[PDB]
Design an enzyme around this catalytic site. Structure first.
Site, mmCIF file in Angstrom:
data_model
loop_
_atom_site.group_PDB
_atom_site.id
_atom_site.type_symbol
_atom_site.label_atom_id
_atom_site.label_comp_id
_atom_site.label_asym_id
_atom_site.label_seq_id
_atom_site.Cartn_x
_atom_site.Cartn_y
_atom_site.Cartn_z
ATOM 1 N NE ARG A 87 -3.791 2.478 2.312
ATOM 2 C CZ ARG A 87 -4.568 2.536 3.014
ATOM 3 N NH1 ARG A 87 -5.042 1.896 4.128
ATOM 4 N NH2 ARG A 87 -5.503 3.702 2.560
ATOM 5 N NE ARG A 97 -8.518 2.128 0.042
ATOM 6 C CZ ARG A 97 -8.753 3.121 1.134
ATOM 7 N NH1 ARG A 97 -9.036 2.392 2.347
ATOM 8 N NH2 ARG A 97 -8.579 4.204 0.973
ATOM 9 C CG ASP A 102 -9.620 -0.166 10.169
ATOM 10 O OD1 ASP A 102 -10.014 -1.396 10.294
ATOM 11 O OD2 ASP A 102 -10.408 0.516 9.405
HETATM 12 C C1 LIG Z 1 -12.125 4.797 1.347
HETATM 13 C C2 LIG Z 1 -13.422 4.467 2.432
HETATM 14 C C3 LIG Z 1 -13.652 5.477 3.057
HETATM 15 N N1 LIG Z 1 -14.117 3.687 1.568
HETATM 16 C C4 LIG Z 1 -14.629 2.406 2.030
HETATM 17 N N2 LIG Z 1 -15.301 1.878 1.067
HETATM 18 C C5 LIG Z 1 -15.751 0.558 1.758
HETATM 19 N N3 LIG Z 1 -16.943 -0.351 0.832
HETATM 20 N N4 LIG Z 1 -15.028 -0.353 2.293
HETATM 21 C C6 LIG Z 1 -13.739 0.285 2.802
HETATM 22 O O1 LIG Z 1 -13.217 -0.355 3.604
HETATM 23 C C7 LIG Z 1 -13.716 1.767 2.698
HETATM 24 N N5 LIG Z 1 -12.490 2.407 3.365
HETATM 25 C C8 LIG Z 1 -12.325 3.421 3.370
HETATM 26 C C9 LIG Z 1 -11.456 4.108 4.034
HETATM 27 O O2 LIG Z 1 -10.849 5.269 3.740
HETATM 28 N N6 LIG Z 1 -10.935 3.385 5.100
HETATM 29 C C10 LIG Z 1 -9.952 3.977 6.070
HETATM 30 C C11 LIG Z 1 -8.547 3.984 5.382
HETATM 31 O O3 LIG Z 1 -8.324 3.862 4.370
HETATM 32 N N7 LIG Z 1 -7.748 5.017 6.322
HETATM 33 C C12 LIG Z 1 -6.290 5.286 6.118
HETATM 34 C C13 LIG Z 1 -6.141 6.781 6.462
HETATM 35 S S1 LIG Z 1 -6.043 7.078 7.695
HETATM 36 O O4 LIG Z 1 -7.483 6.550 8.450
HETATM 37 O O5 LIG Z 1 -6.275 8.516 7.852
HETATM 38 C C14 LIG Z 1 -5.057 6.034 8.757
HETATM 39 C C15 LIG Z 1 -4.641 6.672 9.818
HETATM 40 O O6 LIG Z 1 -5.984 6.831 10.617
HETATM 41 C C16 LIG Z 1 -5.165 6.916 12.245
HETATM 42 N N8 LIG Z 1 -6.238 6.076 13.056
HETATM 43 C C17 LIG Z 1 -7.088 6.288 13.941
HETATM 44 N N9 LIG Z 1 -7.936 5.771 14.317
HETATM 45 C C18 LIG Z 1 -7.378 4.570 13.860
HETATM 46 C C19 LIG Z 1 -7.935 3.272 13.885
HETATM 47 N N10 LIG Z 1 -8.543 2.784 14.916
HETATM 48 N N11 LIG Z 1 -7.341 2.203 13.314
HETATM 49 C C20 LIG Z 1 -6.425 2.545 12.252
HETATM 50 N N12 LIG Z 1 -5.981 3.788 12.123
HETATM 51 C C21 LIG Z 1 -6.355 4.647 12.961
HETATM 52 C C22 LIG Z 1 -3.951 6.237 12.277
HETATM 53 O O7 LIG Z 1 -3.093 7.191 12.502
HETATM 54 C C23 LIG Z 1 -3.506 5.884 10.470
HETATM 55 O O8 LIG Z 1 -2.378 6.448 10.503
#
Ligand SMILES: CC1(C)Nc2nc(N)[nH]c(=O)c2N=C1C(=O)NCC(=O)NCCS(=O)(=O)C[C@H]1O[C@@H](n2cnc3c(N)ncnc32)[C@H](O)[C@@H]1O
Length: 413
Positions: A87, A97, A102
């Site tokens: 990633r 991605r 998470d």
């Molecule tokens: C793109 C989106 C919105 N759409 C989706 N649509 C569908 N159908 N299914 C999905 O799984 C899905 N995922 C999505 C999405 O953006 N998901 C989250 C993502 O990628 N996040 C990466 C960017 S970030 O959170 O800033 C990462 C950052 O978030 C922070 N964070 C805070 N709480 C956290 C936690 N409980 N677990 C992990 N990280 C945590 C952590 O610092 C990390 O660096």
């Protein structure tokens, strides 16, 4: 310390990405995998004016684990795993991605820092996260909202399909034989593609050779055509199956990979002639490869008896295996296939099937079992009706699944 880890992907080989994540976690001595959830499919949740290029269906799950890793430490791990899987963690937010990991919950822990919030901020707004979580922890409430019945909340969220694909040791390879058109319609190959995906095929095996000699040009064009159609349908498919090309011809393998390698997972050889050039090709494209025992026996009197069948099979496959290995190919990328329909008497096929575990063990290769609708293998009368064949196939399928046979190739799930 127990945690629920959310896992998502919408790029590359999706079920593989998920598996890689889970394996990476399971590899840690300070993590114990307690349970894996089902697989869930949903539309990308996007901002309102994001490029349509980001609108690719997601595969989501979660796993429940125990660990000595504290929340912040576990987060570091998760990032390290996303990186290794490939990633780009500086990529635009909301963009596609290969993997995303998470921390959805940690029992009744409430943690609220800029860098980490648990439960995850959006857990109660995202069906693709709350569904697998609730599957894993039946009675779970968000610790801030203990009054909130999340079963009802999940229902409010909707927009999630629970797939019949699974994360089990055994994957089902659905047969797409391109060898019933009407005056203005020829989408039966498409209608059957949906039937497979819907019923839970993790992989699809596409072949244009019949089980009448056909040219390279025809074979390739049939494959190429289905694959172009697959590509046009990729983004919206509720589940994007791994793709296996079912062919015996080196030239077809070469041409089709040259054009569609990006979307191909595996080459499933129907006859392992010119293993040397094929090995070089598998090495070049880094795909999975299936060695089949098809010696091209044309005389029925010379078919394999059962008493020396295991030595005959293993000797041959081992020899082909070593050639593949000598071309740098990783043993874990090679599967074997008994090839019941080739050069074997009925009692021999039945016998090789009954002793399949011994064969896998001796070969040290994963098994692809093609038992579907073969009377000999199913212990049935050759003149059995389709109904009795599929019912016997399903029952055998259940048994092989329990044996952790790696791939089963079936007409129907
Ligand atoms: C793109 C989106 C919105 N759409 C989706 N649509 C569908 N159908 N299914 C999905 O799984 C899905 N995922 C999505 C999405 O953006 N998901 C989250 C993502 O990628 N996040 C990466 C960017 S970030 O959170 O800033 C990462 C950052 O978030 C922070 N964070 C805070 N709480 C956290 C936690 N409980 N677990 C992990 N990280 C945590 C952590 O610092 C990390 O660096």
């Amino acid at each position: 310390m127990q945690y629920i880890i959310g896992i998502g992907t919408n790029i590359g080989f999706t079920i593989e990405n998920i598996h890689l994540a889970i394996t990476a976690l399971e590899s840690q001595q300070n993590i114990r995998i307690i349970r894996k959830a089902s697989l869930y499919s949903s539309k990308a949740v996007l901002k309102e004016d994001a490029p349509k290029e980001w609108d690719i269906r997601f595969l989501n799950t979660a796993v429940k684990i125990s660990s000595s890793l504290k929340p912040d430490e576990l987060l570091v791990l998760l990032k390290d795993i996303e990186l290794k899987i490939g990633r780009d963690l500086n990529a635009p937010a909301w963009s596609p991605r290969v993997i995303d990991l998470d921390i959805l919950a940690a029992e009744d822990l409430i943690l609220e820092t800029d860098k980490l919030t648990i439960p995850h901020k959006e857990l109660i707004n995202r069906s693709f996260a709350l569904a697998p979580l609730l599957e894993l922890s039946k009675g779970w409430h968000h610790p801030k909202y203990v009054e909130w019945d999340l079963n009802i909340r999940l229902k409010e969220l909707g927009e999630i399909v629970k797939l019949k694909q699974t994360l089990a040791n055994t994957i089902r390879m659905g047969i797409v034989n391109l060898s019933s058109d009407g005056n203005f319609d020829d989408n039966q190959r498409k209608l059957n593609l949906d039937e497979l995906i819907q019923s839970g095929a993790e992989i699809i095996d596409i072949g244009a050779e019949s089980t009448k000699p056909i040219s390279i040009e025809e074979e390739f064009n049939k494959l190429d055509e289905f694959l172009e159609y697959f590509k046009s349908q990729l983004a919206n498919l509720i589940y994007k199956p791994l793709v296996s090309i079912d062919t015996r011809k080196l030239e077809v393998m070469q041409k089709i990979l040259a054009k569609h390698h990006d979307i191909i997972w595996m080459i499933n050889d129907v006859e392992c002639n010119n293993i040397e050039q094929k090995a070089q090709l598998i090495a070049k494209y880094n795909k999975k490869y299936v060695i089949i025992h098809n010696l091209g026996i044309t005389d029925r009197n010379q078919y394999l008896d059962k008493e020396n069948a295991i030595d005959n099979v293993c000797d041959y496959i081992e020899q082909k295996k070593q050639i593949l290995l000598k071309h740098g190919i990783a043993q874990q990328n090679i599967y074997f296939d008994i090839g019941f329909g080739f050069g074997k008497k009925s009692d021999t096929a039945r016998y090789l099937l009954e002793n399949i575990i011994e064969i896998k063990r001796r070969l040290e290769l994963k098994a692809l079992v093609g038992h579907s609708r073969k009377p000999s293998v199913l212990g049935l009368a050759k003149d059995s009706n389709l109904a009795t064949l599929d019912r016997a196939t399903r029952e055998l399928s259940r048994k092989l699944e329990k044996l952790d046979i790696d791939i089963i190739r079936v007409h129907k799930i």
